[PDB]
Structure 1
């Protein structure tokens, strides 16, 4: 198995900008074959042996977001920086 990855439970929610229903991250990561454990608000995710591409929290975020569907991500223009 690849080494375990520590990641906050709401990290996919923050990066997506969507408040997913609770347990979405844990369910999706378990769906793709990873072992997920809880420690307060921090998950420890061990990817399956056939997923060496999952090495960082960003890799896990893509798994949750693509399975939930990028279409649910709202179009929110960022504020204009003083250019």
Structure 2
């Protein structure tokens, strides 16, 4: 097993800009084969042996987002900086 990865339970929600139903991140990361444990609002995720590409939280975020589907991410123009 690779080293474990720690990330906040709502990190995929923030990156995607979507409030996923509760348990979505934990369910999806287990679905792809990782061991997921809870410590407050922080998940400790140990990827499976066949997923050496999962090394940091950003990798985990892609798994949740692609399985939930990118079509649920809304189109929200960010505010204009004072260019």
Give the TM-score band, short-chain normalised: over 0.9
Give CA deviations for 1:34-60 in whole Å, capped at 9, x if unaligned: 000000000000000000000000000
What is the TM-score when the length of structure 2 is the normalising length?
1.00
TM-score if structure 1 supplies the norm length?
1.00
Provide the aligned length of Structure 1 versus Structure 2.
Answer: 83
Tell me how far apart the structure 1 counterparts of residues 2 and 56 of structure 2 sit (CA, whole Å).
Answer: 11
Q: Flag structure 2 segments of 5+ consecutive residues without an equivalent.
A: none
How big is the shift at 1:61?
Answer: 0.1
RMSD: 0.2
State the 4+ residue runs in structure 1 displaced beyond 6 angstroms. Answer: none
